[PDB]
From Swiss-Prot:
Residues 178-362 form the DCUN1 domain. The record marks 231 as: Essential for interaction with UBE2M. Its main location: nucleus. Disulfide bonds: none annotated. Keywords: Acetylation, Cytoplasm, Nucleus, Proto-oncogene, Ubl conjugation, Ubl conjugation pathway. It comes from the Eukaryota. Mono- and poly-ubiquitinated by ARIH2 and ARIH1. Monoubiquitination by ARIH2 is mediated by an interaction between autoubiquitinated ARIH2 and the UBA-like domain. The monoubiquitinated form preferentially interacts with non-neddylated cullins and modulates cullin RING ligase (CRL) complex composition and activity. Changing residue 325 to A: Loss of interaction with CUL1, CUL2, CUL3, CULA4, CULA5 CAND1 and RBX1. Does not affect both nucleus and cytoplasm localization. Reduces cullin neddylation. Loss of interaction with CUL1, CUL2, CUL3, CULA4 and CULA4. This is DCN1-like protein 1. Changing residue 349 to R: Loss of interaction with CUL1, CUL2, CUL3, CULA4, CULA5 CAND1 and RBX1. Does not affect both nucleus and cytoplasm localization. Reduces cullin neddylation. Loss of interaction with CUL1, CUL2, CUL3, CULA4 and CULA4.
Length: 373
């Protein structure tokens, strides 16, 4: 088949796909991009349709099988290589980019393609002076000029690697990035399972970040890393997370923590974090979340947000598993409920647990109403 990766075995192992895997990241399951559009692989837009089934239909046509929205790394490379061929055709039609592209060696061509993926042809074509320097093989001067640009300020770590590629004509910046992340992962990995960081490694990670391991900030990091389960941090989770956060060091990750915290000020992002917590805390082998574990995580994530959290604790402690829908709807209850619960709609199809809670809260509510200020 024309797309077979065996047709590229004459190339080096480092290539444009592996470059963008480092600079942008790779997703093997359909996800929504910044604009809400279904995407997979390295930034491959599937459709603007709101229908996941439509996105799956487009993916199946492009891959050649029924994927149910999940592909392999090799399949993602085939999709990406088609996108590269299209980007190169565009470069070759562009009077502002063709001369420099033609003049460049293969490694530096990859750096230019990287730029086009990030900012489009129009954006790259704006770099008139730097492109002329590249065409003249004035590598150090091009590197200096590119570093003065807004591009550098927008994505400093990616831009530094692309600039180093123009400066040297080698893959050194990508070899160095990979080694840094490998050596950092090796500081944390479980000595008995190289595929994960265990509890001791998570503790070392927290210590290196100057985080109380009991801070909600730890769970915020797990959310940003899309961690599947508490007490484990898989190698893929660590590498994908450091990539998506643009960090190759603990110092850089430490600087990102306040930005992750700030994201939660949006109710939509807090809801995402709140819903993530359920699947993260649940035992993989169980369908629901044990009540005691639910209470612990509820107290971490809802303290200061749910005005009836203390009453909720008392209600549950006098109770005898929590499904996902009950977990999710507690946040909606917290958002709508009046300070005295007077606006609760019993016909609203809330979980029985919440119906019972509203009834249980009646003595406390009444007592407060008869208490002097
Ligand atoms: C504070 C809530 N938390 C967690 O967020 C856990 N994090 C994870 O595993 C983890 C997984 C992947 C990636 C990252 C960054 C974290 C885990 C834990 C915390 C600190 C620690 F160094 C080791 C483990 C844990 C434990 C054992 N308990 N919980 C408590 C649960 C409920 C309330 C308070 C804390 C925590």
């Amino acid at each position: 088949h024309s797309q077979d990766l065996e047709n590229l075995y004459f190339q080096g192992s480092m290539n444009i796909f592996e470059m963008l895997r480092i600079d942008e990241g790779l997703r093997l399951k359909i996800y929504k991009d910044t604009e809400g559009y279904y995407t997979i692989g390295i930034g491959h837009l599937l459709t603007k349709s709101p229908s996941l089934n439509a996105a799956k239909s487009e993916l199946d046509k492009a891959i050649g099988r029924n994927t149910n929205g999940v592909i392999t790394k090799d399949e993602a490379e085939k999709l990406f290589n088609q996108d590269v061929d299209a980007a190169v055709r565009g470069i070759l039609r562009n009077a502002k980019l063709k001369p420099v592209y033609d003049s460049l060696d293969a490694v530096r061509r990859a750096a230019l393609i990287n730029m086009v993926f990030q900012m489009g042809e129009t954006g790259v074509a704006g770099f008139t002076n730097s492109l002329r320097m590249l065409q003249q093989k004035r590598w150090d001067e091009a590197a200096v000029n590119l570093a003065k640009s807004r591009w550098y300020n927008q994505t400093p770590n990616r831009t530094k690697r692309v600039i180093t590629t123009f400066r040297t004509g080698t893959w050194d910046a990508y070899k160095n990035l990979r080694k840094k992340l490998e050596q950092l992962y090796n500081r944390y990995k479980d000595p008995q399972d190289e595929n994960k960081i265990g509890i001791d490694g998570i503790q070392q990670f927290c210590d290196d970040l100057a985080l109380d391991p009991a801070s909600i900030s730890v769970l915020i990091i797990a959310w940003k890393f899309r961690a599947a389960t508490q007490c484990e941090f898989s190698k893929q989770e660590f590498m994908d997370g450091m990539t998506e956060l643009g960090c190759d060091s603990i110092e850089k990750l430490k600087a990102q923590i306040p930005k992750m915290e700030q994201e939660l000020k949006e109710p939509g992002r807090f809801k995402d974090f709140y819903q993530f917590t359920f699947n993260f805390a649940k035992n993989p082998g169980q369908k629901g979340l044990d009540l005691e574990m639910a209470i612990a995580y509820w107290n971490l994530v809802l303290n200061g947000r749910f005005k009836f959290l203390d009453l909720w604790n008392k209600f549950l402690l006098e109770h005898h598993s929590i499904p996902k829908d009950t977990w999710n709807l507690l946040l909606d209850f917290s958002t709508m409920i009046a300070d005295d619960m007077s606006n609760y709609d019993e016909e609203g199809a809330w979980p029985v647990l919440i119906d019972d809670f509203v009834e249980f809260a009646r003595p406390q509510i009444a007592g407060t109403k008869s208490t002097t200020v």
